[PDB]
Ligand SMILES: Nc1nc2ccccc2[nH]1
Ligand SMILES: Nc1nc2ccccc2[nH]1
């Protein structure tokens with residue numbers, strides 16, 4: 018996360034950390050608990066090539082990474098079949114936990130938006146995670162969870178911006194219809210935040226509007242952070258996750 | 261270049277090296293001379309974002325990198341407007357030199373194939389460059405120009421292979437129509453060879469069938485090297501390069 | 504620390520961590536509390552060249568680095584005037600804190616040995632620190648304080664071993680009189696543990712026999728870890744630290 | 747080499763490059779041809795621990811490293827028995843070649859100074875090599891041999907300088923009597939130049955006064971380059987090398 022601060026212990030109870038086997042269970046991507054037994058994340062974090070379930074673990078909300086770990090095994094990885102690269106789209110995936118987690122006020126699910134829900138440009142939303150605090154700058158120990166308020170940006174405006182200072186023809190889509198943008202030159206997501214949540218509070222109730230997907234650098238001019246638009250893939254999600 | 265060997269001094273007179281400014285003019289991509297004033301290369305080597313021309317230089321056929329340099333400045337960089345990523349396609353671009361080069365048996369242009377040439381499996385083709393000799397393994401000094409004969413594979417077969425061991429739906433095409441596959445687990449192109457030529461001997465003449473574009477790793481099982489299919493972009497090239 | 508394991512919460516109340524300013528206050532050397540206002544460490548950790556005091560801070564006993572930091576500033580750095588390199592000797596230094604610390608069962612001083620104590624082979628001794636767990640292998644997060652029991656080895660025996668597989672003349676002493684050896688191919692100190700304490704339980708009390716100083720690699724055959732022999736520098740220490 | 751330039755092809759015919767087996771025969775230190783079959787170099791380049799001769803090779807004078815290599819096998823490595831570290835002294839060694847070299851005007855031996863020869867403070871001498879051009883700054887391809895004129899510095903003055911800004915007692919020798927210094931904040935030797943020669947033209951002949959040994963940083967204030975004093979070890983040298 019770029020341009021944000023450490024999150025209060027009572028904030029973002031649905032945030033999760035994905036760990037990969039190694040000298041130690043290292044954090045490589047974020048995710049969100051959308052059901053007691055299901056985690057939502059980005060496809061590029063666990064694909065497109067098939068990965069060994071035994072080398073993956075999920076860690077529920079932690080104030081500091083690695084300090085009070087309680088790793089959970091994953092029983093199944095479901096990557097959207099239309100996914101190959103983030104730039105092409107469908108950057109979304111599901112992780113079925115071995116056991117349904119025991120929800121508490123400190124750790125619980127985030128609510129998904131209704132199919133008709135559309136987050137307007139400028140609406141203040143939040144992105145969270147343990148990723149880099151700037152281009153090539155790793156989050157330093159003790160690795161606190163970070164948060165940053167970012168305003169939603171209209172898909173068309175975002176697409177236009179990405180063409181600025183680029184050779185790509187203005188008529189050639191870069192930011193596609195299943196993607197959403199947010200952030201600016203001071204606040205953005207970054208490597209390591211991928212798969213994590215972008216939440217906006219509507220009628221009270223926090224709704225997850227997107228999944229951290231990709232971008233060109235972090236907080237770079239005319240290069241807003243790009244997310245997978247959750248509403249676009251609700252049918253696919255609800256094909257595996259109980260409503 | 262993975263596998264293969266050092267190229268004879270008389271071979272590949274059209275090979276060029278792209279250099280980026282810094283502590284020394286370092287090689288970052290390949291290319292080919294297709295006209296005394298024009299170099300053909302890959303779009304991902306110079307795009308999708310517009311970079312400063314001043315920071316780019318071209319080196320014509322050299323037996324070893326850096327030892328006998330005579331760097332040439334560029335006046336224009338033109339990238340296919342459809343380009344954004346190599347996985348999507350249109351990974352091709354042109355560089356116009358500030359002056360026409362003098363040709364000879366040691367340095368001259370490569371011939372482009374006629375629109376109808378398909379380059380089927382069994383066709384004798386070679387790829388050349390100063391790229392890595394293996395995954396994560398750079399070409400060691402004195403940096404000789406390497407070459408390797410690679411077997412052509414039909415797009416449909418190649419696409420099927422890229423789906424093996426991947427979550428991507430079988431009907432979601434990975435190897436696209438404007439692309440071409442070549443190589444195996446012993447012969448392939450690698451990082452650093454990008455933008456370089458894949459040439460095939462047809463009826464006694466060398467024709468550039470492709471431009472080193474991308475691939476998953478180098479010489480990895482079920483993951484042959486991918487090239488931009490030159491015949492697919494002949495009309496675009498001819499808008500800029502005199503015949 | 505190579506071998507051994509995570510130290511219990513109640514052990515080594517005198518262990519200290521030296522921090523250098525930068526992206527975060529990073530651990531670079533060990534140390535021990537020998538007086539409410541003084542820390543004993545290795546000269547090579549802070550010398551031979553004079554560095555800015557401001558860029559240094561001390562962290563008293565804590566289970567995991569960076570988690571519960573309470574950094575303490577230093578008013579003075581005193582390095583043995585005979586020091587230039589660890590191999591030559593006199594690798595010992597003192598840090599005076601700006602304020603005396605409050606002691607308790609969880610944080611208190613370690614007892615220095617009587618001038619006559621020799622710490623012969625067979626005596627039970629432990630070395631502690633947050634250093635590498637193996638050659639060029641850092642302690643992974645959450646960075647627990649490690650400990651390991653190491654076997655003492657007589658100086659002359661150690662010296663002979665250091666000559667095995669070396670061009671150095673047998674009569675040219677390598678392990679000097681102001682030094683002490685401990686450890687084997689399974690138990691040893693390593694980079695990052697430097698300045699830390701080697702303590703032995705004598706007549707029911709813990710005495711600091713040495714300070715982690717140097718060695719060829721970590722836990723390498725015929726190359727035991729080398730420590731500064733505390734008894735040799737008691738007079739110097741007592742010139743600054745009161746009883 | 748710091749602050750110098752490319753050496754003319756006709757100069758320094760006695761310069762050699764030591765290579766170590768690996769992906770390629772990489773340069774790791776310099777040396778000088780002092781006899782048709784003997785190379786003089788620094789002990790720390792090949793010691794203190796014994797290494798097998800099979801992984802070592804010698805390359806005679808070439809304008810650019812790796813370009814037109816003609817590697818020579820070594821029959822024996824002789825390290826001074828009093829050597830353990832550069833800071834202690836005796837940093838000198840001999841490499842006996844498998845065959846005597848056929849000297850030419852382009853490649854021949856350098857002359858060793860008489861036992862009584864004393865190089866006065868201020869005398870203009872030269873140090874040559876393929877080492878870093880600045881701290882942590884490697885020599886860029888094509889790796890030309892570099893040279894730099896450095897003035898001799900009186901031993902006492904050099905020792906005094908090394909104490910400035912250090913904790914070491916003024917009466918404790920840092921630069922010893924078997925060592926020699928030269929260079930300033932603009933011109934100096936650096937990592938990779940070790941084992942190489944420092945030659946001074948006395949009257950009308952080039953004499954090798956020193957062997958690049960060590961220092962604190964390169965071209966750093968009050969930290970001139972330190973070399974092993976050749977006249978100090980003339981007897982040891984002539985014990986193996988025919989006069
Ligand atoms: N702006 C931005 N946000 C990002 C998150 C993950 C990877 C690349 C990114 N670029
Ligand atoms: N086989 C192959 N060739 C490549 C060239 C550039 C990047 C990735 C590649 N994989």
Ligand SMILES: Nc1nc2ccccc2[nH]1
Pocket residue numbers: 691692693694695696697715716717718719720721722723726727728729
């Ligand atoms: N064996 C050993 N132990 C060491 C501790 C610090 C630096 C080098 C070392 N080598």
Ligand SMILES: Nc1nc2ccccc2[nH]1
Pocket residue numbers: 934935936937938939940958959960961962963964965966969970971972
């Ligand atoms: N000044 C200086 N010259 C050096 C040559 C080799 C290693 C360290 C050095 N420091």
